[PDB]
Design a binder for this molecule. Structure first.
Ligand code: MMC
Ligand code: MMC
Ligand code: MMC
Ligand code: MMC
Ligand code: MMC
Ligand code: MMC
Ligand SMILES: [Mg+2]
Lengths: 376, 376, 376
C-alpha cells in the first residue's frame, strides 16, 4: 500500500483535504493537510532530534543522590539514544557497579530503557557506545562533604555536588573529578598531580605537583608526555590548567570552594605528598580539610597559585626569569591561597599570601583548577 | 483501520515500497519508505522536541520594546508548550497587566496561542505552569535609561536592555533585575540590598547593604536566613554575589555598566540609604546617576567593591583579619569603583580607589553584581 | 483520502487500536496508537526542529582541514535548512572559491545538499540566505602557524585552529579573525586596528591602533563612527573590546596565545604600523612572531594592554585622569604583555611590564582581544 506523494516543489502549490496525508519524496517524510494551507504541515524526521536530552528542571542536575552508594535519574527526563526514545516518568534508580573510593563514574541511558553507572567512560559493561549513551556522572569520594566547618569524615560515598550531566556541567574539556561550588562554578576535588596528562588534573591517591615534584610538561606547549617542567613556577601551573580548559582560582572562588574546611588550621609536619591522604608528620588528618562541596585538602595542605596578581613587586628592571620567554618589570606577586602544612593557625579558606613572584618555586606550592558552570 | 507494523529489529531488514508507511511498534512512530533504503525513514516523536524554542535571530532577544509600557514578541518565534506548537509569523503584541515602577515581569507563551506578561514568575493570571510557558521577561524601571551622559528621567517604563529570554540571558541563577550592557555582559540594575535572600541582589526601593547595614548572611555559607554579617567586608559581599551566581565587577565592566551617568558628580549629603531613591541631604536626584543601560545609582552614590586587587598593600606579616578564616600577608587593596555620596567631583564611571583592604567596612561601601551574557 | 481525526481534547480520552493512525486537527500532526495508551503518541512537526544542527563529536569543530586550501565537513553532521534535512555520512569536501591571504570565509550547507565556502557572510554566490545556511567558517592566513617556537612561514593557508561552527565558537558577537588557543579560549589573530567598527577588531593589512593612532570611538559609548579617541589609554582599548563582546587578555591567556612565537626577540627598528606586515626598520620579519595557534605579531611588535592590574602605583591622591569620568587613587598600573619593537631581548610570550598607568598613551602600546570558547 503506497500513499499519494510528490516532490517538495510539487508540494508547495498543493492544498490537500482536511486530514489527508501525503508523502514528500524528496524529504522522505509525511505531510499533514487541513484543506486550506498551501504546502501542508511537514512532520520531522528522527535524524533531526538525535542527541535530544530534555529535563523537567533545567536549572538542576538530572540525578538525585539517594544514599552513600545509590542515586536516581529524575522524573521527566527524556533521552534520545540509538534512534530510540527513552524517558523516565518517575524517579528511577541507577544500577550501580562496585564503587571504589576516589573513582569517577559515568552514567549511561541505554536503548533498552535501562540506566546504569560504570567506571568506563566509553561504554558500560554489557553494552556498546552505540546502544549506551553517556549522559553524566559523579565522583565517589574517599569521605563525606563537610556538614559544618570542621571538614568531613572518611566514609566513602557519592559527592552529591559532583553530579554532572551533559547540560549541567563544568565547561572544562573533561568533567571528571570536579564539584559544583554553591551552584556557581566548578572546582577540582584534588590538587594537581604530577601525572595530569594521564590522570587529569584531579585524582585521588596520586603524587601532588609542587616545587619539589613539578608537573608533566603540557603536550599542547612543547611537552612530549615524559618530560616535567624544570620547576613549579606559576607560569607552569597556569599552563597546565589551560591545557585542560581550566584556570587557577581567584580570591572569590577560593573562599567559596574552601568553605567548610577546618579554619585557621594546617596539616602540620614536613610535607603533604599525596592527594586524599594524611601528610608526612601530620597533626591533623586529611579529612579535616574537606570543604562543604567535597573539595579535598582545600586548605592548610598546600598553597595554590591563584589567577590574580598584587602585593609585593619584583625589581623595577627588565628581568629574564620566565623560562626563556621574555622579561618582566615591576612584576607583582601571584596570589597564593589556602596555606600549606607549615602555616600553623594562618591557613584557611581566606588565607592569602601576596609576596611570591610567579617565577618562584617551592615545595609547599601547588595548584587547584576551576572553570565555569554551564547550563544549556 | 490498522497499518502494517513491526518491531525495530523487524524494521532493520525491511525495505518497503516507495510512499509506503509502516508503524514501528517499539517506538510507536511512523516510518516512511522509498523502495530502496533498508529500515526506512523513522519520524520523530513529539516528546523529543519538548521545550523547543526557535528564534529567527538568535543573536538578539526575542522581544521588542514598542513603547514605555508595551512590547512585542518577534516574527519567526516558534515555541513548544504543553505538547503544542505556537508560532508568531508577525510581530505580536504582548498582553500587559498593570505595570508598577521598580518591578520585574515574566513573559509567557500559552498553549492557546496567546502571549502575556505577569508579575508572577510561576504562572500568569488565568493559566497554570502547564498551559503557560515562561520564555523571558523584563524590568519596568522607575525612570528612563540615559539618552546621553546626564543620567535619565523619572518616567517609569520598560528598560529595553533588561529584556531577556531563555536563550538570551544572564548566566546568573536568577535573571531578574539585570540589564544587558553593550551586548557584552549583564549588570544588576540596583546596588545590593540587605534582604537579598528574599529580594534577590537587585531590587527597587530597598535598604542598601553597606558597612553600617551588612547583608544577610548567605544560607549557602552558614547563614540561617535571619543573621547578617558582622560587617561589610569585601569577603562578605563577594560571598553574597557567589550565592546568587554573580560576581563583583572588574574595572572594564564597571566603566561599561556606568557609562551614561553624570560624570564627576556625587549625590552629596550624608547617606544613600535606599535603591532608586534620593540620598539623605542629596544635592543631586537619584536619576542623575542612571547609566545608558538603566543601571540605577551607577556612580556617585556608593562605592562598589570590585573583583580586582592592587594598589596599597597591608602589612608584610600574617594578619588574621578574615573573620576567622586564616591570615593574609602583604594583602593588596580590593578595588572600589564609582565613588560615594561624599566624593564630590571624583565620582564617575571610571572612579577607582585602591587603598582599602578587603577586611575593612565603611558606610559608603556596598556592592553591585554582574555575570556573563549567555546566547544559546 | 482523509483520515480519522479529532481535536486535542477529543484525543485525550481516546485509545485507538494498535497501529492505528489519527490526525490531531488542532496540531495538524499525526498520532500513532497502540491499543492501550490514552491519547496515543503524537509526532513532531518539522517547525519544531528548525535550525537543528547535530554533530557526531560535539567536543570538536565540524570541519577538518585537509590541506592549505581545502577542508571537509565531518561524517555524522546533520543540518536542518529551509525545511529540509541535509546530512553527510562520510567526510565531504567543502567547495572552495578563490582564497585570498588575510581573509575570512563562511561555510554554508545548502538545501540542495551541497557545502561550500564564501567571502560573503550573508549568502554564497548562486544562493540566498534562505536556501543556504551559514554553519561556520575559517580564516585564510598570510602564513603558517608555528611548528615549533620560531614563528611561522609566509605561505597563505587555512589556519586549522580558526575553524569555528555555530556550536563550537568564540562567545564574541562576531567570530571572524579569531583562533582557538589550546582548545581553551579564542584570541584575535591580529592586533586591534583603528577602523575596528568596519573591519572588526582583527584584520590583516590594516593600520594598528596605538598611542599615535587611536582607535575609532565606540558607537556604543558616544562615538559617531568618525571620531577617534583623544589617545590610546587603557580605558579606550578596554572600551573597544567591550563594544565587540571581547576583553583584553590576562597573563595566563597571553602566555597561551603567544606560545610558538620567537622568544626573547623584538621586531626592531622604529615602528610596527600594520598588521601581518614587516615593521619599519625591522630586523625580523613579521612571521617570526606567529604563535602555534596562528596569532600574528603575537610578541615583540606591540605591547597589548592586559585586563589585569598590579605593579607600580600612581599617587595616593584623587587624580582626574580618566577622560572626565572621575578620579583614581593609588591606581595600580595596567598590565602590558608581549613587548614592542624596541624591547630587544625582553619581548616574548611571558613579557610583562607593570609600570604604566591606564591613563597613559604611547606609540608602542595597542591591544589584542580574546573571549571564551563556547561548546553547545
Ligand atoms: C544506561 Hg545501560
Ligand atoms: C573558562 Hg576555565
Ligand atoms: C502567554 Hg498566556
Ligand atoms: C560567571 Hg557570574
Ligand atoms: C552550502 Hg551551498
Ligand atoms: C566574555 Hg568576552
Ligand atoms: Mg590584580
Amino acid at each position: 500500500v503506497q500513499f499519494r506523494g510528490g516532490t517538495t516543489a510539487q508540494h508547495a502549490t498543493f492544498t490537500g483535504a482536511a486530514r489527508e496525508i501525503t508523502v514528500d519524496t524528496d524529504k522522505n517524510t509525511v505531510v499533514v493537510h487541513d484543506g486550506a494551507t498551501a504546502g501542508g504541515f511537514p512532520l520531522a524526521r528522527h535524524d533531526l532530534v538525535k542527541t535530544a536530552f530534555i529535563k523537567a528542571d533545567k536549572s538542576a542536575v538530572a540525578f538525585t543522590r539517594t544514599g552513600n552508594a545509590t542515586a536516581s535519574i529524575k522524573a521527566g527526563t527524556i533521552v534520545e539514544v540509538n534512534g530510540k526514545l527513552v524517558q523516565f516518568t518517575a524517579d528511577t534508580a541507577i544500577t550501580m557497579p562496585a564503587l571504589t573510593a576516589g573513582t569517577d563514574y559515568a552514567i549511561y541511558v541505554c536503548d533498552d530503557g535501562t540506566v546504569r553507572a560504570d567506571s568506563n567512560f566509553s561504554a558500560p559493561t554489557g553494552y556498546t557506545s552505540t546502544t549506551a549513551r553517556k549522559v553524566g556522572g559523579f565522583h565517589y569520594a574517599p569521605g563525606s562533604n563537610a556538614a559544618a566547618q570542621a571538614g568531613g569524615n572518611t566514609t566513602a560515598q557519592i559527592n552529591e555536588y559532583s553530579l554532572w550531566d551533559i547540560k549541567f556541567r563544568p565547561a572544562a574539556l573533561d568533567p571528571r573529578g570536579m564539584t559544583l561550588v554553591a551552584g556557581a562554578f566548578w572546582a577540582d576535588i584534588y590538587l594537581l598531580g604530577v601525572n595530569h596528562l594521564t590522570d587529569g588534573t584531579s585524582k585521588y591517591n596520586v603524587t601532588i605537583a609542587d616545587g619539589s615534584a613539578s608537573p608533566k610538561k603540557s603536550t599542547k606547549f612543547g611537552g612530549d608526555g615524559s618530560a616535567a617542567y624544570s620547576d613549579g613556577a606559576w607560569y607552569n601551573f597556569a599552563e597546565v590548567m589551560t591545557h585542560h580548559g581550566k584556570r587557577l582560582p581567584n580570591y572569590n572562588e577560593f573562599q567559596a570552594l574552601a568553605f567548610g574546611t577546618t579554619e585557621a588550621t594546617s596539616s602540620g609536619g614536613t610535607d603533604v605528598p599525596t592527594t586524599g591522604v594524611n601528610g608526612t608528620g601530620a597533626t591533623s588528618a586529611w579529612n579535616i580539610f574537606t570543604s562543604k562541596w567535597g573539595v579535598v585538602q582545600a586548605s592548610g595542605c598546600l598553597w595554590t597559585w591563584g589567577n590574580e596578581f598584587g602585593g609585593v613587586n619584583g625589581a623595577s628592571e627588565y628581568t629574564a626569569n620566565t623560562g626563556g620567554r621574555g622579561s618582566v618589570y615591576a612584576q607583582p606577586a601571584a596570589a597564593l591561597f589556602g596555606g600549606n602544612w607549615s602555616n600553623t593557625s594562618h591557613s584557611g579558606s581566606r588565607a592569602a599570601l601576596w609576596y611570591v613572584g610567579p617565577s618562584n618555586s617551592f615545595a609547599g606550592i601547588g595548584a587547584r583548577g576551576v572553570c565555569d558552570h554551564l547550563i544549556l
